[PDB]
Write a protein that binds this ligand. Structure first.
Ligand SMILES: CCCCCCCCCCCCO[C@@H]1O[C@H](CO)[C@@H](O[C@H]2O[C@H](CO)[C@@H](O)[C@H](O)[C@H]2O)[C@H](O)[C@H]1O
Ligand SMILES: CCCCCCCCCCCCO[C@@H]1O[C@H](CO)[C@@H](O[C@H]2O[C@H](CO)[C@@H](O)[C@H](O)[C@H]2O)[C@H](O)[C@H]1O
Ligand SMILES: CCCCCCCCCCCCO[C@@H]1O[C@H](CO)[C@@H](O[C@H]2O[C@H](CO)[C@@H](O)[C@H](O)[C@H]2O)[C@H](O)[C@H]1O
Ligand SMILES: CC(C)CCC[C@@H](C)[C@H]1CC[C@H]2[C@@H]3CC=C4C[C@@H](O)CC[C@]4(C)[C@H]3CC[C@]12C
Ligand SMILES: CC(C)CCC[C@@H](C)[C@H]1CC[C@H]2[C@@H]3CC=C4C[C@@H](O)CC[C@]4(C)[C@H]3CC[C@]12C
Ligand SMILES: *[C@@H]1O[C@H](CO)[C@@H](O)[C@H](O)[C@H]1NC(C)=O
Lengths: 825, 61, 61
């Protein structure tokens, strides 16, 4: 079912001029070559050339064939072959004496290469001494591509009981035309030429002088490839004369697929020949007792259709079990795939990216609600809900954390409770209970299929407004830092800085601005250098993967060297203590903390629970939609019901303990996904999916309280450059940003995307203007004191695309612009 | 003769794929580097003729 | 230099005597800003973000 093929050439040794046989390629269902170093290249398929096949056919149509030869040693075979050459007027009688000595010569394998110092091509002459070829020579193709352990694999691949074939090539100047000799032994016998213990059955001998359009190495490769095929081997095993071998060779040539040179080859056009090749293979096996091996091993007998992540199912809890069965079989791969240093770099980046907003929001919430909930509670909740969500989640690329609308709701609830005279930390328990009940009810009826109705319109609007608000807030923080310490002519000294610096300071604002600009510039420069060609690829990519930590370390050291100037630093709480121990505990009694809780509040607490559920559900589902789009080479499936269930349940349980509930964050998740992306020379080659990164980030956030000495030396202004870098980078994939950019270019320089060719310019501009008006309305209502009515407006965007726009544009334009898929439109 | 030489050059830079039992996609995609090398060998010379438009002296060098 | 305290009665009629608080960083900021703006306008000259006449006039200045 498989055999061994060995190809040898007549060469000369560099040390002292002599002739000998050296092996050059081996065949076990695949071709392996060896270079001048002496180490075999990687196995590959065989790709012959037109000239080799043509000359092989020409020389084989008249070559002599000896069948059922009764010989055991090489000398008897060579004698009979030379006698048959003489009989058929192939060679002159004065040439046998030299050829016999040439064939009966020592054979040296690869293991003896370094002892001699290498070999060079040689040409036999009438006298018998080597000489250089007259015609020009060229470097070999296979040894240049594939050549630039193995014995165990070689001994394993060969079946225990099989025969082997030997092919010998070499040039002789005392000849007229090339000669081919094919001899099959009557009974397989051992030979001194091959060191392997496999017996030898077939023998090829290819001789001749130099001539144009004849390369003997390629011709020997073609002969070995012909012998390697099963059909020709079976035909030779049953052939009784040369006619059967000629017919088999004609059949082999008939089923060959030759492709001509082109100008701009592509991997897409080359894949349009897939059926044709298949057909040819079938024809090759049409009239043979054998059968193909890969009859249906090239395509999956399944469908890429009805298998959709979200779909209505006739049974309860269908989505949950479907997501579990789709994702969990990849758990070992998720664990293993996290052994690259890129995972470590992403962990380091996301650690700061998730730690800073948590601290800021915790401080603001502590100063807003009279320290009912502070920083330590938020840190602990983030750590726990990150560890558990990474261990038991379906999409481990999401980052959980506190957000803005949640803070707005907390402020409104605290104000309402203060006005009505009720407690604050107790009602949150009942809100969490109602959240648990509501999420159980929703997941039980798989009511997540509504996510299908959200098109690209709302996703782009939401992402653009989030990124823009992020950048605005960063610049607002910088301007606040400027406002705290103005640029004056006089500054009072001996100011007290123990709680916080009172009054202006000399060189704070400009230093902070300089540090931010330097961090941003260094990060962008390293990002550009990642795609450069200025170093070895491995070291270049290793350096470029660690750009953000390198820039952070550089700027931290620069700030550390300066002594007298003051810059704000990161601060974390001293220990795992509750923010206010006077009126709070680790566990909250639902019945009442200091006074009894009214029954009407317990029965009416469902109303804010619905709003919280809407906010969390909408944000998480839109984030999952954006992160897991088909364009970003996401191979493993992403679940929708399991993530929502986990998040809302975890929120309720945390609300029981007094810690706040969280939700998926868009910018952090997008940054985490972009960090774990391997790009090809551009094209997104792959995305590394694993669960280690999130778990490590959560553990580090939890343990941050134990790292005061390290975190106390990191200035706050450095992270602003990182925030700006994140905000700018997270704006690349947005399509509305591109359509806004095209508002300024003249129509001569527009790209070749479908939505430019299919529709006219002033319709694209009207579309963009409508979307910008929607964005402006969203911003205005966000600034309006009626902020809690913000999410509803967002979903009100869905009917607009469904009703109003079809009354203004046409179906082709709307389908080309609002495309569900990026590549396909 | 020039057309015959060009046809010979065309035939030099073509590769044949024998009938292999490997999966179709892998076998067809294995040809990209070899074909790229062959085409790079095809376009390296591109010699036609030197700038022999006119052998003018112009009486003013 | 960058210190914690500065003298607040320093005569600067011929030349500023003694250190001053915010001169060095303001100078560095101005230099970096000028260089960055010049480079950005030089790049924008060859861009395709405006009508050619106005774009070239702006990039020339
Ligand atoms: C999820 C539904 C769809 C979301 C669409 C995208 C909108 C997301 C951002 C909107 C909510 C912003 O979230 C929050 O809003 C308030 C509204 O002024 C902002 O401003 C707030 O600042 C602090 C509280 O942080 C208050 O002292 C101040 O009175 C208040 O105006 C906050 O700085 C921002 O964190
Ligand atoms: C349109 C696209 C937007 C993306 C590009 C944005 C570039 C310009 C960003 C700078 C915006 C200025 O941001 C400015 O920040 C200061 C912060 O002290 C705010 O100042 C306000 O909030 C601070 C609290 O932070 C208060 O102490 C202060 O009393 C109050 O006036 C201003 O209300 C806001 O306007
Ligand atoms: C704009 C994008 C490019 C980003 C580049 C940003 C560069 C920022 C440069 C900060 C200015 C350096 O500021 C200077 O640093 C050196 C550090 O060696 C400090 O320290 C120097 O003096 C002190 C005391 O005089 C010595 O103890 C110290 O050995 C010496 O190095 C100086 O007191 C400070 O004046
Ligand atoms: C060694 C580290 C610290 C500094 C790296 C220097 C980087 C920022 C600079 C130096 C040379 C620059 C490259 C010079 C040549 C080109 C070709 C152009 O088609 C893409 C940009 C690119 C690739 C430039 C990117 C930025 C670049 C790589
Ligand atoms: C002075 C006013 C009118 C214009 C100032 C903006 C200029 C300086 C900046 C803002 C964004 C910058 C562009 C950002 C993106 C690219 C794409 C690249 O392929 C050509 C350069 C180009 C186009 C940059 C040129 C400079 C640029 C246009
Ligand atoms: C802690 O709570 C008590 C009672 O609500 C309050 O008086 C005190 O100011 C709080 N501590 C703070 C806000 O630091």
């Amino acid at each position: 079912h498989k055999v061994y093929v060995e190809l040898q050439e007549l060469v000369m040794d560099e040390k002292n001029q002599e002739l000998r046989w050296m092996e050059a390629a081996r065949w076990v269902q695949l071709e392996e070559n060896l270079g001048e170093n002496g180490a075999w290249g990687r196995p590959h398929l065989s790709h012959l050339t037109f000239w080799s096949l043509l000359e092989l056919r020409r020389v084989f149509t008249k070559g002599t064939v000896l069948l059922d030869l009764q010989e055991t040693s090489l000398a008897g075979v060579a004698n009979q072959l030379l006698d048959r050459f003489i009989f058929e007027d192939q060679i002159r009688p004065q040439d046998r004496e030299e050829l016999l000595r040439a064939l009966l010569l020592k054979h040296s394998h690869a293991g003896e290469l370094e002892a001699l110092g290498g070999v060079k091509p040689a040409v036999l002459t009438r006298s018998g001494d080597p000489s250089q070829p007259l015609l020009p020579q060229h470097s070999s193709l296979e040894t240049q591509l594939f050549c630039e352990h193995s014995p165990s694999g070689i001994l394993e691949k060969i079946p225990p009981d099989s025969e082997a074939t030997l092919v010998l090539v070499g040039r002789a100047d005392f000849l007229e035309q090339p000669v081919l000799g094919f001899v099959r032994l009557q009974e397989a016998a051992e030979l001194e030429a091959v060191e392997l213990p496999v017996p030898i059955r077939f023998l090829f001998v290819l001789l001749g002088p130099e001539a144009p359009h004849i390369d003997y190495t390629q011709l020997g490769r073609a002969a070995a490839t012909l012998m390697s095929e099963r059909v020709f081997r079976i035909d030779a095993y049953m052939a009784q004369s040369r006619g059967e071998l000629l017919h088999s060779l004609e059949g082999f040539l008939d089923c060959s697929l030759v492709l001509p040179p082109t100008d701009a080859p592509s991997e897409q056009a080359l894949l349009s020949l897939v059926p044709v090749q298949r057909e040819l293979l079938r024809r090759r096996y049409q009239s043979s007792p054998a059968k193909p091996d890969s009859s249906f091993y090239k395509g999956l007998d399944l469908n890429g259709g009805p298998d959709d992540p979200l779909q209505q199912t006739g049974q309860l809890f269908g989505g949950l079990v479907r997501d579990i069965r789709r994702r969990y079989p990849y758990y070992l791969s998720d664990i293993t795939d996290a052994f690259s240093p890129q995972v470590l770099a992403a962990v380091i980046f996301i650690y700061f990216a998730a730690l800073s907003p948590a601290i800021t929001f915790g401080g603001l919430l502590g100063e807003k609600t009279r320290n009912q909930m502070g920083v330590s509670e938020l840190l602990i909740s983030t750590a726990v809900q990150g560890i558990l969500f990474a261990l038991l989640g379906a999409q481990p690329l999401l980052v959980v954390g506190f957000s803005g609308p949640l803070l707005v709701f907390e402020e409104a609830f605290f104000s309402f409770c203060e006005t009505n005279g009720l407690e604050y930390i107790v009602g949150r328990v009942w809100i969490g209970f109602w959240l648990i009940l509501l999420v159980v009810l929703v997941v039980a009826f798989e009511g997540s299929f509504l996510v299908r109705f959200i098109s690209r319109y709302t996703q782009e609007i939401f992402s653009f407004l989030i990124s823009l608000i992020f950048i605005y807030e960063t610049f607002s923080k910088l301007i606040k830092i400027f406002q705290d310490h103005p640029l004056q002519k006089t500054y009072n000294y001996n100011v007290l800085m123990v709680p916080k610096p009172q009054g202006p300071l000399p060189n704070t604002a400009l230093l902070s601005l300089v540090l931010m600009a330097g961090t941003f510039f260094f990060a962008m420069m390293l990002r550009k250098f990642k795609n450069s060609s200025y170093f070895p690829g491995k070291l270049r990519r290793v350096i470029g993967d660690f750009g953000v930590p390198i820039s952070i370390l550089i700027m931290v050291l620069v700030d550390f060297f300066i002594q007298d100037t003051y810059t704000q630093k990161l601060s974390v709480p001293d220990g795992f203590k509750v923010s206010n121990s006077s009126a709070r505990g680790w566990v909250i009694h639902p019945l009442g903390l200091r006074s009894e809780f009214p029954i009407w509040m317990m029965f009416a607490s469902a109303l804010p629970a619905l709003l919280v559920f809407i906010l969390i559900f909408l944000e998480s589902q839109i984030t999952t939609l954006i992160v897991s789009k088909p364009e970003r080479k996401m191979v493993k499936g992403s679940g929708f019901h399991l993530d929502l269930l986990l998040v809302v349940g975890m929120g309720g349980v945390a609300a029981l303990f007094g810690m706040p509930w969280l939700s998926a964050t868009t910018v952090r998740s997008v940054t985490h996904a972009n960090a774990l992306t391997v790009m090809g020379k551009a094209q997104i080659q792959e995305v590394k999916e694993q669960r280690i990164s999130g778990l490590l980030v959560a553990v580090l956030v939890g343990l941050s309280i134990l790292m005061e000495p390290i975190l106390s030396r990191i200035p706050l202004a450095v992270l602003f450059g990182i925030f700006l870098y994140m905000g700018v980078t997270s704006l690349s994939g947005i399509q509305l940003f591109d359509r806004i950019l095209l508002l300024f270019k003249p129509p001569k320089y527009h790209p070749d995307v479908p939505y430019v060719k299919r529709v006219k310019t002033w319709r694209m501009h009207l579309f963009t203007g409508i979307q910008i008006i929607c964005l402006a309305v969203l911003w205005v209502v966000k600034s309006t004191p009626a902020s809690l009515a913000l999410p509803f407006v967002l979903i009100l965007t869905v009917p607009l695309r469904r009703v109003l726009l079809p009354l203004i544009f046409r179906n082709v334009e709307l389908q080309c612009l609002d495309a569900d898929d990026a590549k396909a439109t």
